[PDB]
């Protein structure tokens, strides 16, 4: 019988890309009390992987759902954890202060109503210059950044900030597909894929203009972009090996507790032990030059061989143009100019000192009025990390021929998550399939 | 007041029964993999529906949703397997897979005459997954492919 | 210290085939439709249930319920469709609808020996709709004809 008959097959290995929500597993988690220790499966340490043979698939990092996940999810969860914490409304009282004895941080005093009736005026609040806003000519009286938009949520003393390895996996009916290929562009077809039960460890580090503690490239430094032609989009540079950087510590200090309400506690810094020290980071100058060179090579690969220029940030708000940095649960904003002050063409110290500012009022993700207050950490904070990549932007106003100009990049944090999620897809399984064959469903 | 009749076996009635006889109570177990509020009552259903409604706005209602969904998943977790195998229920069924003695050599006269289901179960815990997979491939391999070909003229 | 044995081909390994070979492992594929944590999975499942004890959270927690319910519903949707078609069990089920060459006329040999399910999907995607309808009519007429 030349005429073929329809036969239904069930359990047919096919898939379609589709939007869904993944199941977070906060691997390897008084504890306490972050990351998603209360919004994500406690532990899932052992990933599974199945290699596929003669298959191909098209990947597109720049439109990948999983980023939107983390972008919402992280904000959501971080926000959540602060709901039951103290709102420092009394603190908005007009402060009066004085530079601390050797420009400088200041030793402030202020009236505040607490306990019963009346108030206690004489205080020892050591605030950093970039947390306050001077009012009225040269008077020493003023108030915190933008109290007009609340910005007073004190992060619970018990809540840590430490970024921990988290994994994502797919719910029943979905599968995570990964491109098993070195040099993968981040955009286009992959000729060697495999499925995974979960992703590899992700490290949710909030930082800007600088990719820290991520995954490394294997052969040679790589540069990814949605559209190199389009000068308005940020490019992502992933190092072939990391560059270690050690960031330092302020004056040693003691945290003071201030009673502000019926159990409401406000923490600040009141006592300095020993000399006043400048917080900064140190990095090998030579090593930076080494890997910078590596990058430059590939930048040249992207436009013939035009000379490469690195200019520091265009200028503006420190919280935008300096590189933010997490360490010890405190927030640094450091000047990066020394790292982006070079030109490269056809052809000093040992390390670089990068001065940092230490802030306490932090506006996370440029939210409107939802800024927080970071309580101070007793003692000094020593931390060191590994630079694993860069976020760069090509200057749209390049009018000099023979050169290509870059500045520290920009955009939101979505790009920051891309640095890990650039090889994963989430697809839905479609069990039912139908194909012709030479057999008829017999009656009776 | 309330007076009482008689079994009518009963839930888990065969739990300690010798497997040979316990094998004939499968109807009781299967009947209740979705329950504990059986029969109208008919005030219990009324109450449960009332709490399912009233508590729809709060955590305790959510915990009931959680439990209910769990029940369904567990049910379907077994139905899926029974569907995949050529054993749509039917309380029992046989396969083409030969018993591999590596799993257990024990004599059937010991099994069916002096052992509970739980004792028996202890002995095959580590071979469960293997056994399933072998049933699965036996189901597909030939019993379905060749079957298709047996209607091929 | 963990050692590795043999296959026993796992989840989606069949994608490399070749529909002729893809008739195998249909169970391997199907069996995992309701779980990404198949098996007791000591030191996983325990945490999976522990997490569901922690559903005093709102918004976030409830999203997981949505996920679970949709998984169940997705499964059941397919089960109903197969029931309608008279394919209650299981893997392979032939119909009495003759293949319309309009949909495709590639050699049978091409299909099974040198074509992959993913491709097949792409090729006859636009006809899926009416194919299903026709299958329903078959079973409908069979309900009455078998009387």
């Amino acid at each position, epitope marked *: 019988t030349e005429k073929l008959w329809v036969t239904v097959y069930y359990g047919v290995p096919v898939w379609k890309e589709a939007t869904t929500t993944l199941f977070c597993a906060s691997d*390897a988690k008084e504890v306490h009390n972050v990351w998603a220790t209360h919004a994500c499966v406690p*532990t899932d*340490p*052992n990933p*599974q*992987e*199945v290699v596929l043979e003669n298959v191909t698939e098209h990947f597109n990092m720049w439109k990948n759902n999983m980023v939107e996940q983390m972008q919402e999810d992280i904000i959501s969860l971080w926000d959540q954890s602060l709901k039951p914490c103290v709102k420092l409304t009394p603190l908005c009282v007009t402060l009066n202060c004085k530079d601390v004895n050797a420009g400088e941080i200041k030793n402030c005093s202020f009236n505040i109503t607490t306990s019963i009736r009346d108030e206690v005026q004489k205080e020892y609040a050591l605030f950093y210059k970039l947390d306050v806003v001077p009012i009225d000519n040269n008077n020493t009286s003023y108030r915190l950044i933008s109290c007009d938009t609340s910005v007073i949520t004190q992060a619970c003393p018990k809540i840590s900030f430490e970024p921990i390895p988290i994994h994502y996996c797919a719910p029943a009916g979905f599968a995570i597909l990964k491109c098993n290929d070195k040099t993968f562009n981040g955009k286009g077809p992959c000729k060697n894929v495999s499925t995974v*039960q979960c992703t590899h460890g992700i490290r949710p580090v909030v930082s800007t203009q600088l990719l820290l503690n991520g995954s490394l490239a294997e052969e040679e430094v790589v540069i990814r972009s949605d559209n190199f032609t389009n000068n308005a989009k940020t490019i992502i540079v992933q190092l072939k090996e990391s560059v270690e950087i050690n960031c330092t510590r302020p004056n040693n200090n003691t945290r003071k507790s201030i009673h502000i309400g019926p159990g409401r506690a406000f923490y600040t810094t009141g006592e300095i032990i020993g000399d006043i020290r400048q917080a900064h980071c140190n990095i090998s100058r030579a090593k930076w030059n080494d890997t910078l060179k590596q990058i430059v090579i590939k930048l040249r690969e992207q436009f013939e061989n035009k000379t490469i220029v690195f200019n520091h940030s265009s200028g503006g708000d420190p919280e935008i143009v300096m590189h933010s940095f997490n360490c010890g649960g405190e927030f640094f904003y450091c000047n990066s100019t020394q790292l982006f002050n070079s030109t490269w063409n056809n052809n000093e110290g040992n390390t670089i000192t990068l001065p940092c500012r230490i802030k306490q009022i932090i506006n996370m993700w440029q939210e409107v009025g939802k800024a927080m207050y970071a309580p101070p950490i007793r003692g000094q904070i020593r931390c060191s990390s590994n630079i694993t990549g860069l976020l760069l932007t090509r200057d749209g106003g390049i009018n000099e021929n023979g050169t290509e100009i870059f500045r520290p990049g920009g955009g939101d944090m979505r790009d920051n998550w891309r640095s890990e999620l650039y090889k994963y897809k989430v697809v839905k399984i479609e069990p039912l399939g139908v194909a012709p064959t030479k057999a008829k469903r017999r009656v009776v | 007041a309330v007076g009482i009749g008689a079994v009518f076996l009963g839930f888990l009635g065969a739990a300690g029964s010798t497997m040979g006889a316990a094998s004939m109570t499968l109807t009781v177990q299967a009947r209740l993999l979705l329950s504990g509020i059986v029969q109208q009552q008919n005030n219990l259903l009324r109450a449960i529906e009332a709490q399912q409604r009233m508590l729809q706005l709060t955590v305790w209602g959510i915990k009931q949703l959680q439990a209910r969904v769990l029940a369904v998943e567990r049910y379907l977790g077994d139905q899926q397997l029974l569907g995949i195998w050529g054993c749509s229920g039917k309380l029992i069924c046989t396969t083409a897979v030969p018993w591999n003695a590596s799993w257990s050599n024990k004599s059937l006269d010991r099994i069916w005459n002096n052992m509970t289901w739980m004792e028996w179960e202890r002995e095959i815990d*580590n*071979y469960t*997954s*293997e056994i*399933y*997979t072998l049933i699965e491939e036996s189901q597909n391999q030939q019993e379905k492919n060749e079957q298709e070909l047996l209607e091929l003229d | *210290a*963990v*050692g*590795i*044995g*043999a*296959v*026993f*081909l*796992g*989840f989606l*390994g069949a994608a490399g085939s070749t529909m002729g070979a893809a008739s195998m492992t249909l169970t*391997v594929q199907a*069996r*995992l439709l309701l779980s*990404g944590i*198949v*098996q007791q999975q*000591n*030191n996983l499942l325990r945490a999976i249930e522990a997490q569901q004890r922690m559903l005093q959270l709102t918004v976030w927690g409830i999203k997981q319920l949505q996920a679970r319910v949709l998984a169940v519903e997705r499964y059941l949707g397919d089960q109903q469709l197969l029931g309608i078609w008279g394919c209650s069990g299981k893997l392979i089920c032939t119909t009495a609808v003759p293949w319309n060459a309009s949909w495709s006329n590639k050699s049978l040999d091409r299909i099974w020996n040198n074509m992959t399910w993913m491709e097949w999907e792409r090729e006859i995607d636009n006809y899926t709709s009416e194919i299903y309808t026709l299958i329903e009519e078959s079973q409908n007429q069979q309900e009455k004809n078998e009387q």
Partner: antibody, heavy 135, light 113 residues
Framework: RVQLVESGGGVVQPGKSVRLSCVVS????????MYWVRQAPGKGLEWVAA????????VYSNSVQGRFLVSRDNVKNTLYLEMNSLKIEDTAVYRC????????????????????????????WGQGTTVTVSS | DIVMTQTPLSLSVTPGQPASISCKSS???????????LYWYRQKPGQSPQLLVF???NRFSGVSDRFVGSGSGTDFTLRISRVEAEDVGFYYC?????????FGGGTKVDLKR
């Protein structure tokens, strides 16, 4: 005991091949994977090789990879470690030992389809035998 | 490969004086079944290897009560309470999370004189 007995040692020249044998008294075997280790005259301990309880999975140390051969006979209750192409560095006292926990049968993972084995530390050693190399 | 080291090789003790040996690992030994894959061993000159503890803070049956394991994360320890003069000998840390199975420094306890 679980009494471990080893023999077949001595001194041999480089490039030769040997066999070491290990017999254990009063011991199930089928439920227990076994180890071979190396105590060097250079005063250190090295793991050399491991073999599953049912002799279906064997792992070698990187230094002996492609040189040594572990095998089993669970009916005769005996382990064998042969050694091909001996090099001078291999001069050492080799010790036959047994694992600490019991091992169950390999567990088949239904998601990946891989048949996994689980290993562990060890609790009983013999005294092994000295095997030296050169002239 | 997982590698690791122990305290400096020569540890002198006295009868009745407790003493401890740590073991620093290159990677946390968390195992997939929810436990930590760390073992301690010892042996005397002319004496085959003996098992001291088999889990972190869980000594092995037959081993004296003096032996108290502890520690966590990436760096663990073994403390012997009330060290006896007969506790001298070589001490080894051993990891079993992955292959190859490796050993620590191989320290040795001896007496003060």
């Amino acid at each position: 005991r679980v009494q471990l007995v080893e023999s077949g040692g001595g001194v041999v020249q480089p490039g030769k091949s040997v066999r070491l044998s290990c017999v254990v008294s009063d011991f199930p075997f089928s439920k227990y994977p076994m180890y071979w280790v190396r105590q060097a005259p250079g005063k250190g301990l090295e793991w050399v090789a491991a073999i599953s309880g049912d002799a279906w999975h064997v792992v070698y140390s990187n230094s002996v990879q492609g040189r040594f051969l572990v095998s089993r006979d669970n009916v005769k209750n005996t382990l064998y470690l042969e050694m091909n192409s001996l090099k001078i560095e291999d001069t050492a006292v080799y010790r036959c030992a047994r694992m600490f926990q019991e091992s169950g049968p390999p567990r088949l993972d239904r998601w990946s389809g891989r048949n996994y084995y689980y290993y562990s530390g060890m609790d009983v050693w013999g005294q092994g035998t000295t095997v030296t190399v050169s002239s | 490969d997982i590698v690791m080291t122990q305290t400096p090789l020569s540890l002198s003790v006295t009868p009745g004086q407790p003493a401890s040996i740590s073991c620093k690992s290159s990677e946390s030994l968390r195992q997939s079944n929810g436990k930590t894959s760390l073992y301690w061993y010892r042996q005397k000159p002319g004496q085959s290897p003996q098992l001291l503890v088999f889990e972190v803070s869980n000594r092995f049956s037959g081993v004296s009560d003096r032996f108290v394991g502890s520690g966590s994360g990436t760096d663990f320890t073994l403390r012997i309470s009330r060290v006896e003069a007969e506790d001298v000998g070589f001490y080894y840390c051993m990891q079993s999370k992955d292959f190859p199975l490796t050993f620590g420094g191989g320290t040795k306890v001896d007496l003060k004189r």
